[PDB]
């Protein structure tokens, strides 16, 4: 191109970031909500052939026993910030002997978004930004929390968020089915029915991944049989 990367448009907005955010809407759909006793996270997997055992398709990972994450967009550039998250969490536990909150983690992870430039930029650095949307989740000193991220370093706290291609239908159908005193069962049922509504396949018992975090237990990723009892309805 003939326009550089660190440029502005006649609207105050950068170009490459406005272009990368136009990619997130080409990824899979992810959902995350919070309650007074736990957070739930769910993600869809778009397999392509009866082969390619989906056991390898992993889109929900463990930043720590009390913190998880879910990604959408370019899954490649995603596995560069997860190692940084784990590194920072362990470095904190090593220096201070305690657990890192969620806000600190998300801030440290988002500080690395707008580091890029065609010039020196301390060689060994980035030539372009990451195309990925991240949704964190976990318990900390002040109840269950939840956050959100975008490829511009503009994270924001939320309570029920949905990203992916069809991120509108899963929000207009999420503004009315939420109340501040909902439990985990109905939460997961609502998430699963709206996923069903937005899914492209017949919602098999293995076309999706799910996880929960509540104070008592740690990060627990569900099995295949547990995902059966719930789908019976």
């Amino acid at each position: 191109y003939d326009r550089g990367v660190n440029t502005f448009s006649p609207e105050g907005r950068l170009f490459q970031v406005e272009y990368d955010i136009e990619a997130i809407k080409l990824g899979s759909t992810a959902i995350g909500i919070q309650t007074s006793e736990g957070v739930c996270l769910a993600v869809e997997k778009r397999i392509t052939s009866p082969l390619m055992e989906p056991s390898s398709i992993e889109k929900i990972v463990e930043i720590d026993a009390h913190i998880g994450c879910a990604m959408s967009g370019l899954i490649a550039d995603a596995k560069t910030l997860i190692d940084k998250a784990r590194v920072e969490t362990q470095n904190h536990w090593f220096t201070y002997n305690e657990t890192m909150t969620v806000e600190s983690v998300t801030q440290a992870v988002s500080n690395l978004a707008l580091q890029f430039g065609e010039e020196d930029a301390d060689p060994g650095a980035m030539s372009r930004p990451f195309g990925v949307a991240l949704l964190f989740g976990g318990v900390d000193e002040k109840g269950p929390q939840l956050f959100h991220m975008d490829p511009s370093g503009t994270f924001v706290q939320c309570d029920a968020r949905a990203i992916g291609s069809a991120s509108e239908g899963a929000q207009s159908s999420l503004q009315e089915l939420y109340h501040k005193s909902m439990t985990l069962k109905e939460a997961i049922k609502s998430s699963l029915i709206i996923l069903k509504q937005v899914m492209e396949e017949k919602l098999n018992a293995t076309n999706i991944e799910l996880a929960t975090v509540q104070p008592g237990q740690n990060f627990h990723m569900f099995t295949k049989e547990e995902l059966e009892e719930v789908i019976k309805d």
């Binding site: 003939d2 326009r3 550089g4 660190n6 440029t7 502005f8 448009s9 006649p10 609207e11 105050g12 907005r13 988002s110 500080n111 978004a113 707008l114 430039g117 065609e118 010039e119 511009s152 370093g153 503009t154 924001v156 706290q157 939320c158």
Partner: protein, 237 residues
């Protein structure tokens, strides 16, 4: 069509189009206001709509026990400059054992922000700042732009449709230099209540307030603590 891609080429009319394009960004967010009195300084921010595309944003930050800021554009650059200021203040306190003034900090900010406006492949910080503090010389309010040109102001607003707030401020000026805290806060709120589209009046979940002075270490006010300040407001005419 060819001078509008780099921060180095001059236009035949003596203008650099890229810095104008950057300044066009600060005039896209939500409005913010800052003012001062004989012994107190105030900053107010107007988080918008609180649920959709602006669910929960933070437009006020703590820099030091006598300096605070409010931002009006990009956020990553804002955090960058914020960390810069914090480190400079900590260095001054570690070396001389005394708080750093405000004018010198603004000078350093301008010196840092002016560099990328000269050389190749760089871009200027697309953020406008409103700074408040109190030093031995009394209270101080400053305004900073993308172009490294800083101003000192008696009362200033930055953000979307802030011209009406400018008019209002210029209207009721001499009333200042005599009013106390609550009065200044009510003034600022009645001022920024104009930017709204004749609807969606103020609430306790959109306004953020920061206050500083001779007996305050730049206190902040969350969503719940504005209610005692929100009273005393008349209905929009």
């Amino acid at each position: 069509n060819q001078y509008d891609n780099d921060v180095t080429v001059w236009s035949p009319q003596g203008r650099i189009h890229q810095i104008e394009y950057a300044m066009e960004a600060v005039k896209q967010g939500s409005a913010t206001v800052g003012l001062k009195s004989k012994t107190h300084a105030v900053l107010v921010a107007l988080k918008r709509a609180q649920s959709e595309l602006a669910a929960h944003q933070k437009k006020i930050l703590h820099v030091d026990n006598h300096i605070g800021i409010s931002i009006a554009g990009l956020t990553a650059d804002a955090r960058l400059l914020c960390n810069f200021m914090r480190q400079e203040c900590l260095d001054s306190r570690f070396v001389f054992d005394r708080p750093l003034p405000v004018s010198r900090l603004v000078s350093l900010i301008g010196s840092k922000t002016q560099i990328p406006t000269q050389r190749y492949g760089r871009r200027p910080y697309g953020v406008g700042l409103l700074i408040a503090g109190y030093d031995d010389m009394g209270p101080h309010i400053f305004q900073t732009c993308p172009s490294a040109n800083y101003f000192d102001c008696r009362a200033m607003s930055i953000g979307a449709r802030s011209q009406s707030a400018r008019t209002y401020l210029e209207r009721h000026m001499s009333e200042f230099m005599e009013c106390n805290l609550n009065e200044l806060v009510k003034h600022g709120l009645r001022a920024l209540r104009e930017t709204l589209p004749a609807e969606q009046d103020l609430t306790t979940k959109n306004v953020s307030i920061g206050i500083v002075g001779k007996d305050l270490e730049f206190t902040i006010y969350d969503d719940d603590d504005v209610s005692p300040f929100l009273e005393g407001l008349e209905e929009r005419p």
